[PDB]
Design a protein around this nucleic acid. Structure first.
Lengths: 75, 74, 18, 107, 179, 433
RNA sequence: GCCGGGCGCGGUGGCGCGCGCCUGUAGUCCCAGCUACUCGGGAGGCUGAGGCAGGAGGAUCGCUUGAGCCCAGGAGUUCUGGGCUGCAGUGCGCUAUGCCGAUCGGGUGUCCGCACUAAGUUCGGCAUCAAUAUGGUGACCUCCCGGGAGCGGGGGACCACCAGGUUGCCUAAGGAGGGGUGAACCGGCCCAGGUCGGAAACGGAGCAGGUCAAAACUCCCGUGCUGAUCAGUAGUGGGAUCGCGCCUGUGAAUAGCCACUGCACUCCAGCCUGUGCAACAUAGCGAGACCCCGUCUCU
């Protein structure tokens, strides 16, 4: 079941937040069939969405910000 | 197989997606409480895996996604 | 001068009984 | 011409050079010209007292220590006045002996 | 115990005056030395310093009498004192010849003491002009000094020989008065 | 009468006036009658008195001018100033000489003390400060020679007369030459002793005068004779214009005052009087003083004192060692000699209060003893510091045989030595207290 | 007919069911208990799918032990090695400095109030005789003579010292020596002044002052005896190292660096104990399970 582009980004932000203490986030990207499917899960809970040319712009920047700010633990 | 550097895994993954942009799928799992990320790209027969706990990586990934999301939509 | 000289001369003669 | 008798002559307290003329054994304590005259006049000797004369060898100036006595030995003709008194020594001695008897001294 | 009289006197004498005849200085030297000696020392004997001490006593008197004769040259009242010192010098010399007859002193020293005593004895009698008695003492002195001289080499005997040469004029004078 | 009797009578006359409850013609006339009677007993010639009285009376009544003076003082001033006239207004100096020449010729009746007054005028000229020689031109009288040479050997003055070889005129002329190479500063030469003034004194004199041009001729006239002085003076004045007179024996007989009055009348200059005997008793006609003594004043006891020479200058160098406290042993002699020159005064015994005996030595019986009492010689026979001790008497207490040895050394007894000692402490305590 | 699976734990007779974790190409919604056994219903899509076998990668996990390496903590004999190295034996080779006096060798010197000696600096203490011939004096004592005093003339006795000399049963030293004081009442002499006596002349005592071999006292040299402060002093022996000093000696070396060898104390691993181990190279073993395919199954 697909989620609206925006909603997707909120659930995702949430996944990361829940997995900080101790867990893992998985995000996968594949051509949908022009669109591309995007899925993410923490092991149990699973979220997905489809991003098109109609929406790549608003989405990339948002998605970009999400990944950058939430992957902090590294050296 | 799992990879030790984002460099390899990237093309490895991108190439794999390329050779079948329809079966391939990419998942991401973040556990805040443990402080680690984990990207995996499968074909349901082939499986690539990257694990990290370095923040320096979240961007490298958010990018990868944003990259894969482009192919899927062109 | 006339006073002492004359008065000492006087005072001496009286005091010295001989 | 009478002769001279100074108390120094009869003083047992005086040495020779001080004027003593008779042996200490016969000399007297402190004869006074007065006493000398008083004993001489009382023997029949003609004598007079020269109260103020002073003996040349007498440093002292007091009274008990001065005066002179004069006695007549011979008489103008030559005869001694009293046979028992030839010389002066004779009188000196006679005096030296009689003064320690004067009542005024035995007192 | 040992004491070499003639050598001692001859070296004391020459070092402190008698080179020029200054009997004052040398007598003084004898006096001071006698001070040191008694000070250090202060039953017959123990050491040989006692013998040195009495000799200094005889030396003092002797030197004095000699100073005196240079003086009585003009002051005959001193000649009386001269003869007294000299008679004293002999007294200490006899007293010395008395100490060296103790049997812990060698016979060489016995010889010196009786030769010294003879020398001074010679001098006193020579000053009293007792020509026979004096010449007896001078020959006695000469005889003993000659006895000492033979028992030693000529080098050791030099001192003794010059001393008999020394008293030979004295011997000569006595003779021409008993002629 | 004499100095003392006219002095008292005159003094008494003066005195009543001082105690005056009012001064009136009457009182005047009686005080002037007492001083009239006074001069007449001194033999002052009665015409002389008369004249002088109405001089005083007129001065003292008609011209009664007391300008800032009391009536009494201006009376005293009258009776004073007129007596100084009566004995010659003022003092008649003898003239000293410059260069080397004064020839003075003595004349004198035998009886006056010419002979003694010659040597007394010798004494003066050694006081005045010249050398004077004696030509003894009187020849016969050889007692005159005797005394006059004796008087000359006592003082220091050459005397020339020798044994009777030559006549007077020639032993003058040879006397002047004998002392003209020896300084002829003054010669004193006397004519001899003649009986009277009647062609005996003067008839000779101007024979002696003609040899030596006389520079003053002095006539020694005896006060005793009183108012015969005038008949003498007359005669000498006339014959000799360069006469002076010397009036001798003022002591003695009561004609002294009228001896003075009478000569002073002539105008023959009185040059000296004799006050008595000793060599220094020859005063330079002090007639100002004498007449003061007469009226009195008296007084005359400060007068000789203050007037004298060692009194302004030489009442200093003694007078400091006095005032510091250098004892008196060094003042005894000075005061006994510096005054030894003697000038007689009543007050000599005024300091020492003691009414008892004389009384008459008022006077000089102290002077008469040859020296001035036996004090010098015990002074010499002390050691200098025995005196200089702050109490020399203390020294003769503590050691007793000092008073014997010093008595014997000086030649006194211990009694008279003891008198000096306590006398020193007597001057001391007196001054302290 | 289909549209997840596994592992662990749990109520429980029992399982659906519940929870957590990982992962597969894979999910969504709504409502509720059947029921004594043992299993819910409905929606959306579809001939492709479900179950199991097998298999390369091994994406894939677990368990377990093994390699390899040793986790955590800790007494401790030594076979084995190590930490500091202990102990034993043996001495090579090299190098430098060596009678311009080295290890070895003798003697002595240096700061020295412990020996000797020079010149002693410089200060002291205690002492320094009598017999005699004669002359000198001073004092005293006893007389004779003259005389009016001061006093003068003459006979002796004694004491004191001095003098140039003569000598002694005398001395450790005994100079016939030098100077000073000799003063207020105690040396003598000359004594101004004063003083006493005196006709005078002069004399007597005698102060001040001056003077002396000759009253006493004291100091000085000379002299002996008796002591020496302290010897930044010189030359000869002694004393802590011999260092610095000097003279010479038999003799010809000495110093330094190390090497090899055996055994090992004490501690340590091989010891003891328990959660020794993740997966750094990789083990044994078991297995979930996709991907491909085998087999069975279907409105």
């Amino acid at each position: 079941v697909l989620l609206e582009s925006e909603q997707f980004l909120t659930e995702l932000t949430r996944l990361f937040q829940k997995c900080r203490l101790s867990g893992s986030v998985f995000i996968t990207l594949k051509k949908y069939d022009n669109k591309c499917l995007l899925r993410a899960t923490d092991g149990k809970k699973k979220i997905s969405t489809v991003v098109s040319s109609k929406e790549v712009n608003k989405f990339q920047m948002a998605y970009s910000n999400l990944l950058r700010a939430n992957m902090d633990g590294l050296k | 197989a799992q990879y030790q550097t984002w460099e390899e895994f990237s093309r490895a993954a991108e190439k794999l997606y390329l050779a079948d942009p329809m079966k391939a799928r990419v998942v991401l799992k973040y556990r805040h409480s443990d402080g680690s990320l984990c990207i995996k790209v499968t074909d349901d027969l082939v499986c690539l895996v990257y694990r990290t706990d370095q923040a320096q990586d979240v961007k490298k990934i958010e990018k990868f996604h944003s990259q894969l999301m482009r192919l899927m939509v062109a | 001068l006339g006073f002492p000289i004359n008065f000492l001369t006087l005072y001496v003669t009286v005091q010295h009984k001989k | 011409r009478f002769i001279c008798i100074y108390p120094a002559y009869l003083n047992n307290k005086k040495t020779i050079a001080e004027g003593r003329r008779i042996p200490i054994s016969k000399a007297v304590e402190n004869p006074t010209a007065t006493e000398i005259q008083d004993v001489c006049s009382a023997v029949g000797l003609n004598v007079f007292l020269e109260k103020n004369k002073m003996y040349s060898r007498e440093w002292n100036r007091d009274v008990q220590y001065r005066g002179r006595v004069r006695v007549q030995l011979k008489q103008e003709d030559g005869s001694l006045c009293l046979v028992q008194f030839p010389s002066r020594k004779s009188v000196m001695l006679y005096a030296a002996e009689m003064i320690p008897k004067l009542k005024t001294r035995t007192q | 115990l040992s004491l070499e009289i003639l050598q001692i006197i001859k070296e004391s004498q020459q070092q402190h005056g008698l080179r020029h005849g200054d009997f004052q200085r040398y007598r003084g030297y004898c006096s001071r030395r006698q001070r040191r000696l008694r000070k250090t020392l202060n039953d017959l004997l123990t050491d040989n310093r006692y013998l040195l001490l009495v000799l200094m006593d005889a030396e003092r008197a002797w030197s004095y009498a000699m100073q005196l004769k240079q003086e009585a040259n003009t002051e005959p009242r001193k000649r009386f004192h001269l003869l007294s010192r000299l008679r004293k010098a002999v007294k200490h010399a006899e007293e010395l010849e008395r100490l060296c007859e103790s049997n812990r002193v060698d016979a060489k020293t016995k010889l010196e003491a009786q030769a010294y005593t003879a020398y001074l004895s010679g001098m006193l009698r020579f000053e009293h002009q007792e020509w026979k008695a004096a010449i007896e003492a001078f020959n006695k002195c000469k005889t003993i000094y000659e006895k000492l001289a033979s028992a030693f080499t000529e080098e050791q005997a030099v001192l003794y020989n010059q001393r008999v040469e020394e008293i030979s004029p004295n011997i000569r004078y006595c003779a021409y008065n008993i002629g | 009468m004499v100095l003392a009797d006219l002095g008292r009578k005159i003094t008494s006359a003066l005195r009543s006036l001082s105690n005056a409850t009012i001064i009136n013609e009457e009182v005047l006339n009686a005080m002037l009658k007492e001083v009239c009677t006074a001069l007449l007993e001194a033999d002052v010639n009665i015409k002389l008195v008369k004249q002088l009285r109405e001089n005083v009376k007129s001065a003292i009544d008609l011209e009664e001018m007391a300008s800032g003076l009391n009536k009494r003082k201006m009376i005293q001033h009258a009776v004073f100033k007129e007596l100084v006239k009566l004995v010659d207004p003022g003092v008649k100096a003898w003239t000293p000489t410059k260069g080397k020449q004064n020839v003075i010729m003595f004349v004198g009746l035998q009886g006056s003390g010419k002979t003694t007054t010659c040597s007394k005028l010798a004494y003066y000229y050694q006081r005045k400060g010249w050398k004077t020689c004696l030509i003894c031109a009187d020849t016969f009288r050889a007692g005159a020679f005797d005394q006059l040479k004796q008087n000359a050997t006592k003082a220091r003055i050459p005397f020339y007369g020798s044994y009777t070889e030559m006549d007077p005129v020639i032993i003058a002329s040879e006397g002047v030459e004998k002392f003209k190479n020896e300084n002829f500063e003054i010669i004193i030469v006397d004519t001899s002793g003649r009986h009277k003034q009647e062609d005996s004194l003067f008839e000779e004199m101007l024979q002696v005068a003609n040899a030596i041009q006389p520079d003053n001729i002095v006539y020694v006239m005896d006060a005793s004779i009183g108012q015969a002085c005038e008949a003498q003076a007359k005669a000498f004045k006339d014959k000799v214009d360069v006469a002076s007179v010397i009036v001798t024996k003022l002591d003695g007989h009561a004609k002294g005052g009228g001896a003075l009055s009478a000569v002073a009348a002539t105008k023959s200059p009185i040059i000296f009087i004799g006050t008595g005997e000793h060599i220094d008793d020859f005063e330079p006609f002090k007639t100002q003083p004498f007449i003061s003594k007469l009226l009195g004043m008296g007084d005359i006891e400060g007068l000789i004192d203050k007037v004298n020479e060692l009194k302004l200058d030489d009442n200093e160098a003694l007078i400091e060692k006095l005032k510091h406290g250098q004892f008196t042993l060094r003042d005894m002699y000075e005061q006994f000699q510096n005054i030894m020159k003697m000038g007689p005064f009543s007050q000599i015994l005024g300091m020492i209060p003691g009414f008892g005996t004389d009384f008459m030595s008022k006077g000089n019986e102290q002077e008469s003893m040859a020296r001035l009492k036996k004090l010098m010689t015990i002074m010499d026979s002390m050691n200098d510091q025995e005196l200089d001790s702050t109490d020399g008497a203390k020294v003769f207490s503590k050691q007793p045989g000092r008073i014997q040895r010093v008595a014997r050394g000086s030649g006194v007894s211990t009694r008279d030595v003891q008198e000096l000692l306590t006398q020193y402490t007597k001057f001391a305590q007196m001054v302290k207290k």
